[PDB]
Amino acid sequence: KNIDSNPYDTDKMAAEFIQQFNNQAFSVGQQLVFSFNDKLFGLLVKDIEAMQKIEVGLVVGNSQVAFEKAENSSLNLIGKAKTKENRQSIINP
Amino acid sequence: KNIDSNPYDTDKMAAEFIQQFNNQAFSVGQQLVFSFNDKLFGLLVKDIEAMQKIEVGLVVGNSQVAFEKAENSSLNLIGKAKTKENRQSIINP
Protein backbone atom coordinates (compact mmCIF):
# COMPACT_ATOMS: atom_id res chain seq x y z
CA LYS A 1 0.00 0.00 0.00
CA ASN A 2 3.04 2.30 0.38
CA ILE A 3 4.66 1.31 -2.93
CA ASP A 4 6.22 4.21 -4.83
CA SER A 5 8.77 4.96 -7.53
CA ASN A 6 10.43 7.76 -5.55
CA PRO A 7 14.25 7.62 -5.43
CA TYR A 8 16.11 6.02 -2.54
CA ASP A 9 19.87 6.18 -2.00
CA THR A 10 21.27 2.69 -1.44
CA ASP A 11 24.35 3.91 0.43
CA LYS A 12 22.12 5.82 2.85
CA MET A 13 20.07 2.67 3.46
CA ALA A 14 23.26 0.69 4.12
CA ALA A 15 24.53 3.34 6.54
CA GLU A 16 21.24 3.38 8.45
CA PHE A 17 21.10 -0.43 8.48
CA ILE A 18 24.60 -0.61 9.97
CA GLN A 19 23.87 2.16 12.49
CA GLN A 20 20.70 0.51 13.79
CA PHE A 21 22.02 -3.08 13.56
CA ASN A 22 25.57 -2.41 14.78
CA ASN A 23 26.81 -5.37 16.83
CA GLN A 24 23.64 -7.29 15.91
CA ALA A 25 23.63 -10.73 14.35
CA PHE A 26 22.28 -11.73 10.94
CA SER A 27 22.02 -15.07 9.13
CA VAL A 28 21.70 -15.86 5.43
CA GLY A 29 18.06 -15.75 4.39
CA GLN A 30 16.88 -13.77 7.42
CA GLN A 31 13.65 -11.85 6.80
CA LEU A 32 13.41 -8.56 8.69
CA VAL A 33 11.79 -5.12 8.67
CA PHE A 34 13.96 -2.10 7.88
CA SER A 35 13.21 1.59 8.44
CA PHE A 36 14.52 4.16 5.94
CA ASN A 37 13.21 7.74 6.06
CA ASP A 38 10.25 6.56 8.16
CA LYS A 39 9.52 4.08 5.34
CA LEU A 40 9.06 0.37 6.07
CA PHE A 41 10.69 -2.25 3.85
CA GLY A 42 11.13 -6.01 3.89
CA LEU A 43 14.75 -7.16 3.78
CA LEU A 44 16.05 -10.63 2.94
CA VAL A 45 19.69 -11.35 3.76
CA LYS A 46 20.89 -12.85 0.47
CA ASP A 47 24.60 -13.32 1.21
CA ILE A 48 27.10 -13.00 4.06
CA GLU A 49 30.77 -12.29 3.34
CA ALA A 50 33.48 -12.91 5.93
CA MET A 51 35.99 -10.15 6.64
CA GLN A 52 34.88 -17.56 3.80
CA LYS A 53 31.11 -17.88 3.36
CA ILE A 54 29.23 -18.24 6.65
CA GLU A 55 25.51 -18.75 7.21
CA VAL A 56 25.58 -16.42 10.25
CA GLY A 57 27.62 -13.42 11.30
CA LEU A 58 27.70 -10.29 13.43
CA VAL A 59 27.07 -6.80 12.04
CA VAL A 60 29.76 -4.20 12.75
CA GLY A 61 30.19 -0.51 11.99
CA ASN A 62 32.26 -1.02 8.83
CA SER A 63 30.08 -3.72 7.26
CA GLN A 64 28.83 -3.03 3.74
CA VAL A 65 25.24 -3.61 2.63
CA ALA A 66 24.24 -4.08 -1.02
CA PHE A 67 20.52 -3.46 -1.59
CA GLU A 68 19.03 -5.09 -4.69
CA LYS A 69 15.42 -4.36 -5.59
CA ALA A 70 13.16 -7.37 -5.24
CA GLU A 71 12.01 -8.64 -8.62
CA ASN A 72 8.66 -7.29 -9.86
CA SER A 73 8.84 -4.26 -7.53
CA SER A 74 8.65 -0.58 -8.49
CA LEU A 75 10.99 0.55 -5.70
CA ASN A 76 13.46 3.09 -7.09
CA LEU A 77 16.98 2.70 -5.70
CA ILE A 78 20.03 4.81 -6.59
CA GLY A 79 23.69 4.69 -5.64
CA LYS A 80 26.67 2.41 -6.09
CA ALA A 81 25.96 0.23 -3.04
CA LYS A 82 24.40 -2.55 -5.14
CA THR A 83 23.03 -1.17 -8.42
CA LYS A 84 21.56 2.02 -9.86
CA GLU A 85 21.24 1.47 -13.61
CA ASN A 86 21.93 -1.34 -16.08
CA ARG A 87 21.81 -1.71 -19.86
CA GLN A 88 21.15 -4.73 -22.09
CA SER A 89 22.72 -4.47 -25.54
CA ILE A 90 20.37 -4.99 -28.48
CA ILE A 91 22.71 -7.29 -30.42
CA ASN A 92 22.67 -10.96 -29.45
CA PRO A 93 25.80 -11.71 -27.36
CA LYS B 1 0.96 -20.10 -4.89
CA ASN B 2 4.71 -19.91 -4.17
CA ILE B 3 5.48 -20.12 -7.90
CA ASP B 4 7.66 -17.19 -8.94
CA SER B 5 9.72 -16.00 -11.90
CA ASN B 6 12.92 -15.59 -9.88
CA PRO B 7 15.62 -17.63 -11.67
CA TYR B 8 16.76 -20.92 -10.16
CA ASP B 9 20.01 -22.73 -10.94
CA THR B 10 19.87 -26.51 -11.29
CA ASP B 11 23.48 -26.87 -10.10
CA LYS B 12 22.94 -25.39 -6.63
CA MET B 13 19.61 -27.15 -6.09
CA ALA B 14 21.02 -30.45 -7.37
CA ALA B 15 24.02 -30.16 -5.03
CA GLU B 16 21.70 -29.50 -2.09
CA PHE B 17 19.36 -32.33 -3.25
CA ILE B 18 22.41 -34.69 -3.07
CA GLN B 19 23.55 -33.27 0.31
CA GLN B 20 20.07 -33.81 1.79
CA PHE B 21 19.26 -37.06 -0.16
CA ASN B 22 22.76 -38.62 -0.70
CA ASN B 23 23.34 -42.23 0.53
CA GLN B 24 19.51 -42.85 0.49
CA ALA B 25 17.07 -45.19 -1.37
CA PHE B 26 15.47 -43.80 -4.61
CA SER B 27 13.03 -45.74 -6.84
CA VAL B 28 11.82 -45.05 -10.37
CA GLY B 29 8.65 -43.01 -10.06
CA GLN B 30 9.40 -42.03 -6.47
CA GLN B 31 7.88 -38.76 -5.25
CA LEU B 32 9.34 -36.59 -2.50
CA VAL B 33 9.62 -33.00 -1.25
CA PHE B 34 12.90 -31.06 -1.33
CA SER B 35 13.83 -27.85 0.49
CA PHE B 36 16.19 -25.27 -1.03
CA ASN B 37 16.69 -21.88 0.64
CA ASP B 38 13.43 -22.38 2.55
CA LYS B 39 11.59 -23.22 -0.68
CA LEU B 40 9.65 -26.47 -1.15
CA PHE B 41 9.63 -28.39 -4.43
CA GLY B 42 7.96 -31.62 -5.49
CA LEU B 43 10.39 -34.08 -7.09
CA LEU B 44 9.42 -37.17 -9.11
CA VAL B 45 11.96 -39.82 -10.08
CA LYS B 46 11.70 -40.48 -13.83
CA ASP B 47 14.71 -42.59 -14.87
CA ILE B 48 17.66 -43.98 -12.90
CA GLU B 49 21.12 -44.80 -14.25
CA ALA B 50 23.80 -46.72 -12.35
CA MET B 51 27.43 -45.58 -12.48
CA GLN B 52 22.60 -49.86 -16.35
CA LYS B 53 19.05 -48.73 -15.59
CA ILE B 54 17.92 -49.85 -12.13
CA GLU B 55 14.41 -49.86 -10.69
CA VAL B 56 15.77 -48.80 -7.28
CA GLY B 57 19.19 -47.29 -6.52
CA LEU B 58 21.05 -45.59 -3.64
CA VAL B 59 21.91 -41.88 -4.26
CA VAL B 60 25.49 -41.25 -2.87
CA GLY B 61 27.98 -38.35 -2.57
CA ASN B 62 29.09 -38.66 -6.20
CA SER B 63 25.46 -39.23 -7.36
CA GLN B 64 24.53 -37.09 -10.40
CA VAL B 65 21.04 -35.62 -10.86
CA ALA B 66 19.54 -34.08 -13.99
CA PHE B 67 16.48 -31.97 -13.17
CA GLU B 68 13.75 -31.21 -15.71
CA LYS B 69 11.00 -28.66 -15.14
CA ALA B 70 7.66 -30.47 -15.14
CA GLU B 71 5.45 -30.20 -18.20
CA ASN B 72 3.39 -26.99 -18.16
CA SER B 73 5.66 -25.76 -15.35
CA SER B 74 6.83 -22.14 -15.28
CA LEU B 75 9.92 -23.14 -13.28
CA ASN B 76 13.11 -21.76 -14.84
CA LEU B 77 15.90 -24.35 -14.89
CA ILE B 78 19.41 -24.16 -16.31
CA GLY B 79 19.46 -27.91 -17.02
CA LYS B 80 17.35 -30.85 -18.11
CA ALA B 81 17.78 -34.20 -19.85
CA LYS B 82 15.35 -36.50 -21.67
CA THR B 83 16.02 -38.47 -24.86
CA LYS B 84 14.37 -41.34 -26.73
CA GLU B 85 13.33 -41.97 -30.33
CA ASN B 86 13.01 -44.43 -33.19
CA ARG B 87 12.45 -44.38 -36.95
CA GLN B 88 10.66 -46.36 -39.65
CA SER B 89 10.68 -46.68 -43.46
CA ILE B 90 8.75 -44.77 -46.13
CA ILE B 91 8.41 -47.72 -48.53
CA ASN B 92 5.75 -50.36 -47.95
CA PRO B 93 7.41 -53.82 -47.80
Side-chain angles (χ1 to χ4, degrees), chain A residues 29-88:
Chain A
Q30 186 172 21
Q31 311 126 8
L32 67 151
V33 293
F34 170 56
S35 181
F36 182 70
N37 290 80
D38 301 357
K39 200 75 168 189
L40 303 177
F41 293 104
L43 297 197
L44 173 60
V45 177
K46 301 293 291 185
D47 174 59
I48 296 177
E49 299 190 4
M51 61 186 299
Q52 178 190 358
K53 288 187 182 179
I54 58 184
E55 293 188 359
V56 62
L58 183 65
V59 172
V60 290
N62 58 26
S63 299
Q64 291 180 304
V65 194
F67 295 83
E68 52 185 338
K69 62 161 194 173
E71 303 299 347
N72 322 329
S73 183
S74 62
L75 177 63
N76 176 12
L77 305 176
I78 52 177
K80 308 177 184 178
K82 164 64 82 207
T83 303
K84 57 97 202 192
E85 187 264 0
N86 178 261
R87 199 86 289 269
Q88 184 69 60

Side-chain angles (χ1 to χ4, degrees), chain B residues 34-68:
Chain B
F34 168 59
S35 174
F36 173 76
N37 287 85
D38 305 340
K39 202 75 172 186
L40 301 183
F41 297 88
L43 308 183
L44 169 61
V45 184
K46 307 299 296 188
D47 189 80
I48 301 176
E49 301 173 356
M51 50 183 332
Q52 178 178 357
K53 288 190 178 183
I54 49 175
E55 306 182 15
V56 65
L58 165 81
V59 177
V60 285
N62 62 21
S63 266
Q64 312 174 244
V65 201
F67 289 93
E68 66 187 15

Side-chain angles (χ1 to χ4, degrees), chain B residues 9-10 14 24 36 45 48 55 57 59 69 76-77 85 92-93:
Chain B
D9 192 322
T10 49
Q24 293 173 198
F36 173 76
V45 184
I48 301 176
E55 306 182 15
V59 177
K69 60 179 189 174
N76 183 18
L77 295 183
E85 47 177 359
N92 295 11

